[PDB]
Each structure stands twice: as C-alpha cells, then as structure tokens.
Amino acid sequence: GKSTTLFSRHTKAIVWGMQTRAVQGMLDFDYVCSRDEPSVAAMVYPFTGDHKQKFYWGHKEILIPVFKNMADAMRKHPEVDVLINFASLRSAYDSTMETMNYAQIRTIAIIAEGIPEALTRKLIKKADQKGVTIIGPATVGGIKPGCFKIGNTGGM
Amino acid sequence: SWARELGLIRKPASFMTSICDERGQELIYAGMPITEVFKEEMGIGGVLGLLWFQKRLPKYSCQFIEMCLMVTADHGPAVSGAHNTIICARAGKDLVSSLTSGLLTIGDRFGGALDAAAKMFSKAFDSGIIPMEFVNKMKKEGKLIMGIGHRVKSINNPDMRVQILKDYVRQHFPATPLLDYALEVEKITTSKKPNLILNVDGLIGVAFVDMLRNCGSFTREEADEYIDIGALNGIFVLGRSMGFIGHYLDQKRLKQGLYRHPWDDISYVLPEHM
Amino acid sequence: SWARELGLIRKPASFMTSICDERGQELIYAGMPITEVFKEEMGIGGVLGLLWFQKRLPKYSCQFIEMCLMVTADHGPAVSGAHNTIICARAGKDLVSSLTSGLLTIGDRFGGALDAAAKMFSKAFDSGIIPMEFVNKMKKEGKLIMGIGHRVKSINNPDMRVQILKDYVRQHFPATPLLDYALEVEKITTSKKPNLILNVDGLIGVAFVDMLRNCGSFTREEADEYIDIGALNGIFVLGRSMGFIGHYLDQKRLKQGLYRHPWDDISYVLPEHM
Amino acid sequence: SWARELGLIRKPASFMTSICDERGQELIYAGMPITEVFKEEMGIGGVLGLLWFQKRLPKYSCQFIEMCLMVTADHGPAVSGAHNTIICARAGKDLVSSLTSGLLTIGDRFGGALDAAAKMFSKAFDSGIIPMEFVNKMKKEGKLIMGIGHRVKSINNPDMRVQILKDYVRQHFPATPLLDYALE
Ligand SMILES: CC(=O)SCCNC(=O)CCNC(=O)[C@H](O)C(C)(C)COP(=O)(O)OP(=O)(O)OC[C@H]1O[C@@H](n2cnc3c(N)ncnc32)[C@H](O)[C@@H]1OP(=O)(O)O
Ligand SMILES: CC(=O)SCCNC(=O)CCNC(=O)[C@H](O)C(C)(C)COP(=O)(O)OP(=O)(O)OC[C@H]1O[C@@H](n2cnc3c(N)ncnc32)[C@H](O)[C@@H]1OP(=O)(O)O
Ligand SMILES: CC(=O)SCCNC(=O)CCNC(=O)[C@H](O)C(C)(C)COP(=O)(O)OP(=O)(O)OC[C@H]1O[C@@H](n2cnc3c(N)ncnc32)[C@H](O)[C@@H]1OP(=O)(O)O
Ligand SMILES: O=C([O-])CC(=O)C(=O)O
Ligand SMILES: O=C([O-])CC(=O)C(=O)O
Ligand SMILES: O=C([O-])CC(=O)C(=O)O
C-alpha cells in the first residue's frame, strides 16, 4: 500500500552520508520556499561519531545532528519519513535494506549509480512487501516546488 | 567588511565558543556580566563554574572549588613537575617557559590520580557492586586502587588535608553517595594494611564527582561528560600552577645557577660498539 | 642512606626551596601549616601570598589578588593565546598540551602589559616627574604608554572592570600614591583623546605595585624585587589559565574537529625559483 | 665526593641512559665515538640510528631516514601546528616558545597518521589476512583506513613525494613485504 502523497511542508528527511553541499542546497531551497522548519532532521555518517554540523537557514546558523547509526537517528526523530541515500554503488543495498526495517520511513531516494540489477530487484521486491516507495536508481532526485527537494535536483 | 555589513553575503564561521562574550558594553562570562559576578560575591569558584561548566554553582560548591584548589597547590619541590619548573627556572628562562616546562609533566603518573580515582570509583558505583567485591575485583586484575594509599600518614595519623576536605563535604554538602562508597572502600583497605587511607587525589576525585552529580543544574549526562572530558585534570593543573609559579619566583629570588646533575647519579649503560 | 643516617658523611644539597615543606606531619606552606591556612579562612589570595611572596598578606590584599585573578580570566576566544588553546584542543590533544600551547603566547605582546605598565609607572614615579612631563617624555621617545589605551570604551563609558578594581583600591587600601600618579596620566591622555583611559592591564599593574610597596611586610627592596622577577606575569598567567582551560573544555564539549585555516586568508608571497 | 672517590660508600644511581657517554676523550654516541661518526661518512640518518635505535644502520636506510625527514618538513602554513607557530611568532615570543607552541599540536588528528598508519597495517599484516578482507574489516567497524586518502591528487595525478619514496623503497631496499601489502 504505497502512498499517494510523498512530500509536503511538514516532510522531514534523513540524509545518509556526509553530503553537506546537497544538504545545504536543500536547506536553502526550504528557506526560499518560506517553509518554517528545515526538511533535513539529521544526517547519518557511519565513519564518524555523533556530533553536529553547522548549517545555514537563510541568514541564521542552525545545527543539524550527525549520527553514527541509523537507529539513534530514528529514535531521536519520530517525524522522519524520507531517507535520501547518498551511499556508493557497493553500499546502497545494505543501507537501504537496513532503512526499510524502520516503520516510519515511507520513501527512500537512492541517489547512487551503478547498483547491480539483481540487488535492485531485491530492493524492489522488499519495497513492495513493505509498501515503501523507492525513487528509481541513478537519479538526481525529484523536486516538489514549494514543498521539498531531494538533494541535488534543480541545482544551485 | 562592506558586503557583510549590509548583509549580501554568507560565510560560515568556525570557533563555536559557548563562553566569554568579550565584545559589547561589558565582558559577559557564560551568561552573567562581570558586574554581576563581582556583585554576587562569587569567588574564583564561581567564575570556575561560569567559565568551565557554564552554570552558576551554588555557594557551597564555589567554596569547595576554592578549597580543592588550595589543597592541590604546592606539594614541595621534590615531585616531578615542580622539579622541572625549578630546573627550567635555574636555566634563566621565563615565567611561562618554566611553569610550562613543569606543567607538561602533569600526566598519568604525576597528577593523573584525580581523574583516574574519579573514573574508577564512578565505574564501580555506576555498575553497582559492593565495596568488598570492588576490592577483590581490583585485586584479581593487577591494578592497585588509584586514590587509595599513602606513604606515611593514614590511621591514628590522618592526612590533615583529607580531614578538612572531608569535614567540608560532610557539613555543607547535601546527599553525597560516592564519598560514602569510597569511605567504605577505605574501611576495607585500611583493614588490609594500616596505611591505604584515602589520598587527597582520591577524595577530591570522588567529592568532585559527587559535587557534579549531586548538586543542581547538572543532569547525569553532563556530570558524566565533564569527568570524561577532563575537568579534574583542570582542577589539578590550575591548582598546582600556583605552586609552580611559586617555585619559579623562589628560585629566581635565591639567584640559583644552572643545574648540571652529577655523573655519579647517572650510570651510563651504553652498548659495546654499535 | 645508612652512612648519612648515623651522620658520618657530607653531601651538599641543591634546590634551596624557601617554600612548601612537604615532609613531616603537615603540608607546611611558607611558614604556616595547612590547617592554619584553612583555619584563618584565607582564600586563594592567602595561599598566593604564602607561596609566591612567603608573607601572610592582610585580608584586604588577598581579596584584591582574587579580584585581579577574576578580571584577568577569559577575555574572549579572539585573543592570540586563547586562539592557540582552541587550535590545540580541536586537534584533540590533552588539557595540559592545549593549555600549555595557548599559554606560551603570554609574552611581551599578548599579556605583557601588566609587567610593562607596572615597570613604566614605577620607574616614572621613583624618579619623580610630574605626569604632564612624563607624558611629554614618552612622546619624545616613541614608546606608547603601556597600560593606557582602549579601542571602544572611552569617556563616561568605562571598562566597567577597571571600575570595580578602582573602587576596591580606593576603598580598602591605605596610602595609594602610584594609582594617583597613573590616574593623573589618565587625566592628561584622556584630554589628548576621548580614548586612552586606564586599561585593566595597567590598573592591575599600578595597583599591584601599590599594594606591594604600600601594605605591610614588604620593605622597598622586596616590593621592587618581585616586579623585576615577574610576579605580575604570574598574576596574568594564573588568571588566564582558568580562561584557557574553560576554552579547552568548551571546544572539547562541542565536539569540533581539526582546524585547517582556509587558503584564501593566507597569501603566499614565495620567491621566484630558489 | 671524597668517600666515593676512594670508594667507602655505595650509592644507587638513577637515570640509566643507554645512549651518549658524554664524558671521556670523545663524545661517544651509542657505542661509536664522534670521530668514527664523521669519518665513516654517515649523515644525520646514521646519528638518528645511533641516538634513537642505538644501532649502526646500513647505508641505504640512513639515506631513507634523511629522505623521510625531507618530505615531512613544512607542508604549508594553513595546517594546525604551523598555524600555532605563526600565531606565537607574531606575538613576538621566542624561537623555542614558538616552535614549542606549534609542536604541541602533533597529536592524533594532526601528525598522528604516521604512527596509526603504521600500527594499522602492521596489525593487519601480522595477523595474516588478505587485503580484500582487511578493507572489508575496516568498513564493518567504522574506522577509515589511516594512511589512505588524498584530497586532490591521487590516480594518474600522483602525490609526487609518495613516488620518490616509493622508488627509493623499491630500489635500494631488500625484502619489503609490508609495502607490497599496503600497495595491494
Ligand atoms: C548532469 C547530471 O545531472 S548527472 C546524471 C545523473 N546523476 C546521478 O546519477 C547522480 C550520481 N551520484 C554520484 O555520483 C555521487 O557521487 C555518489 C552518491 C555515487 C557518491 O559516491 P562516492 O563519492 O563514491 O561515495 P563516498 O563519498 O561515501 O565514498 C566511497 C567509498 O570510499 C570509502 N572511503 C572513503 N575514505 C576512505 C578511507 N580513508 N579509507 C578507506 N576507505 C575510504 C568509503 O568508506 C566508501 O566506501 P564504500 O564504497 O564501501 O561505501
Ligand atoms: C620481632 C620481629 O620483628 S620478627 C617476628 C617474626 N617474623 C615475622 O613474623 C614475619 C612477618 N612478615 C612481614 O611482616 C612482611 O612484611 C609481610 C610478608 C607480612 C608483608 O606484608 P604486607 O607489606 O602488608 O603485604 P603487601 O605489600 O602486599 O600489602 C598488603 C595489601 O595491601 C594491598 N594494597 C597495597 N596498595 C594498595 C592500593 N593502592 N590499593 C589497594 N590495595 C592496595 C595490596 O594489594 C595487598 O593486598 P593483599 O594482602 O590481598 O595481597
Ligand atoms: C565631515 C567633514 O566635513 S570633515 C570634519 C572635520 N575634518 C577634519 O579634518 C577633522 C579630522 N579630525 C580627526 O579626528 C583627525 O583624524 C585627527 C588627526 C585629529 C585624529 O587624530 P588622532 O587619531 O587623535 O591622533 P593620533 O592617532 O596620533 O593619537 C592621538 C594622541 O593619542 C596618543 N596616544 C595614542 N596611542 C596611545 C597609547 N597607547 N598610549 C598613550 N597615548 C597614546 C598620541 O600620543 C597622540 O597624541 P598627539 O596628538 O600628540 O600625536
Ligand atoms: O601524584 C600526585 O598527584 C602528586 C602528589 O601529590 C605527590 O607528591 O605524591
Ligand atoms: O592582556 C593583554 O595584553 C591582551 C588582552 O587580553 C586584551 O585584548 O585586552
Ligand atoms: O600528517 C599529517 O596528518 C599532516 C599533513 O600531512 C597535512 O598537512 O595535512
């Protein structure tokens, strides 16, 4: 039972990877669309400890928490339903399958390019079992103007 | 400077500094201006609470920080760091090079019993074991209990600055559990040997952990953060800096000359031909 | 150890240490044991008087030592030494290495206005010039008056922590001549420009020389010795150690990473082909 | 002084110092006098082998220590330790206080990749695993491989001082397996 709406002005995300240019582009887009809350709630980077990244909300400086595990990224944030997977081609599969074991995630945008077709079919099968809608691979993302933008879509 | 004053540009700042707003009308310490600091009669314990922990500590704890800086001042010139300060002061250096050259000895063997004696008793108390099992859990791993053990003064011969600190943390000091735990471990280890009283290094460690986690404004994940960061090595270094600068001014006042450490105290053990 | 115990041998000792008898029944400080230190309720100003000067200072001077250690604490992280402490803490070093690496900046240009502003006004007062000719003598030789001059706070807009020390000196000191001389030099140089008020770094210098040579137990050749030796460098370094350890604990608690200093703030000016 | 001269009172000596017998006719380094140091034409690599390791190192490795002290010289003033040296030198301090204030940054995050990148590869090689299992073991535990990764110049755009050292450890250098493991 996949959803029929995906992004809104209450939609938050978890960015999997240290992709601070894409996250800053998303936060700048959410400032220029007069949103009241930043659509990136946390970042997940498994190779560094839990800290906070210093980002820009228009003129102001805010702090977005970078976690190490996906579990405590889910535990501190119950409103997150999108995960933007910036992993490589050889680590997008197990990170995506790890994400779909969390119930709040309702859409997963896989940005990676070069995942093998068998692992992608396994991802399609488990996404149809869980009902999570996956954004087709080797994407740039998808932009919903006024509401939400996935990473590097649109551009600057 | 003009494209930022009219605000048409962003630049990400570094150096986050949640302490000491220097600019503006008054020097603001953590959230308190300098006139309120001198008006509320807080000593240097209050400004250690403001700079280091960023919380206005209650008046029984600022006086305890002043007390535990008075006892961790000079402990004679034979010890390792004060020896380095004297050696670097007799070589005619500077105040800051002498104090610095002696201060870089404060490590794990010299001056690292404050932090180790707080971490050991906190790991034994937050795990939840009885002291008669803590002593045997130490004894079956090597590792002498840090913070427990004196060379001379223990029992019917007290340390006389463990006693003053202990009287202060019993009178002006509500609900101190880890000190009671550490005194139970002292009750066991002084039954082992007539020595093995609580050190000053052990008692400031456990009384400082109880001061952090037993007063207000620290929850238990800040009172467990500041012990891991090293806010007790800060107490020992800031306390012993008065003793090291005292040794510098003293060796500069006696007009002592350069030290050379005679060769009959050295015993060279060089290889044959290599 | 046995030929000296039964006393049939001579060994000349080095390290003469007129401070802190560590061995025996108590930590004897200057001459005062540690229980007498905590019984007379002398704060850290009393133990600075005992360790640094070996004199039990009167109770208005220990409180002034604590005041001048409370104003010469942290002054923001922009300054050069606190910058070095932050840079060394963000490399994840130590408390001692971070405080030490920021402490070695306290020299002539950063924090060297205590000792220079004390020596300058003392050499002007002990020679005996009117301030109206001391200012003109300092203009004829280059050499700006150390301890006079601020960047923002000028006239009926004081530093607000030179006010606290000036009122404490004006109230609880008998016989304060050198502060009067330095305030006449302030009266002239604030007629030269709305700035050029007395610094904190200059008023602690002149009030500390005033407190040495004005109060008891210091004659005239001790109170002029401890200025040459550098007791005021000791006051600034011991005061700013709390600020630098506060910056270390702060940059260690915000979990900030290694500094790299962007290349567009650097401007390499290398030679052609060496 | 007189009772020990004719020997009538033993004293336990501390500071055991298995290096640099300073007293006598020649300043004897590790076991070798200063005239044998200068006559045998060993550079500073030979005296680092004598002072630090107390062995007379073979002549291809003294030049290697001179090589790896030449490449680990200055690497620009933007880095953290040279920044502290400049900040302390612009306060007009001293040579030893400036060098010292910048030297106290050589820790784990700055300058701590030499020792960690040696310990990591040595623990991986001593254990005895293939490199493809070593990369996957490091990936499974967090912990980026220390000693691997450049911000700009990597592949058919080399580092050009990894290349000089790599040519030296290939040419004048018998039986080098740990470098071959690190290159895998
Ligand atoms: C014109 C247009 O609009 S584009 C056309 C369509 N656009 C697209 O398809 C978008 C494609 N997206 C991309 O190319 C992006 O670069 C991405 C998302 C694939 C990022 O890929 P990468 O940069 O290679 O991933 P990443 O930065 O995390 O690092 C890759 C590997 O290096 C590893 N690594 C990094 N540092 C180290 C280190 N010191 N030691 C060991 N391993 C390391 C990482 O662990 C990681 O390992 P993994 O592959 O097993 O996960
Ligand atoms: C009249 C005459 O003089 S002759 C009489 C006839 N002769 C005799 O009777 C011989 C008597 N023999 C002795 O007295 C000897 O000194 C001995 C063998 C008993 C030595 O006894 P001790 O010095 O007390 O032993 P030790 O140095 O190990 O210290 C005792 C405990 O203190 C513990 N301890 C020491 N330091 C610490 C510390 N910081 N923290 C925690 N525990 C510590 C030790 O772990 C040890 O524990 P253990 O007993 O469980 O092993
Ligand atoms: C908008 C219009 O229509 S234009 C209006 C009017 N136009 C004008 O030309 C007015 C301009 N007037 C000004 O303000 C000019 O900038 C000036 C020249 C008067 C400014 O002069 P100043 O900056 O005060 O002089 P300077 O910078 O040398 O320092 C002032 C004094 O402070 C003293 N001083 C400075 N630093 C220190 C110190 N650290 N310690 C002690 N004394 C000090 C100096 O000895 C100097 O004395 P001097 O006047 O004998 O040299
Ligand atoms: O080790 C220390 O903390 C210094 C000390 O008190 C001693 O001289 O024994
Ligand atoms: O003490 C100094 O000389 C430097 C200082 O703190 C200031 O900027 O006021
Ligand atoms: O060895 C180090 O980590 C320091 C270094 O090369 C650099 O300048 O980036």
Swiss-Prot record, chain A:
It is found in: Cytoplasm, Cytosol. There is a cross-link at residues 54, 60, 68 (Glycyl lysine isopeptide (Lys-Gly) (interchain with G-Cter in ubiquitin)). Signal peptide: none annotated. Changing residue 68 to R/Q: Decreased acetylation and increased de novo lipid synthesis. Abolished ubiquitination by the BCR(KLHL25) complex. The modification N6-acetyllysine is found at residues 54, 60, 68. Phosphorylated by PKA and GSK3 in a sequential manner; phosphorylation results in activation of its activity. Transmembrane segments: none annotated. The modification Phosphothreonine is found at residue 153. Homotetramer. Catalyzes the cleavage of citrate into oxaloacetate and acetyl-CoA, the latter serving as common substrate in multiple biochemical reactions in protein, carbohydrate and lipid metabolism. In the N-terminal section; belongs to the succinate/malate CoA ligase beta subunit family. This is ATP-citrate synthase. It comes from Homo sapiens. The chain holds residues 487 to 642 of 1101 of the full protein.
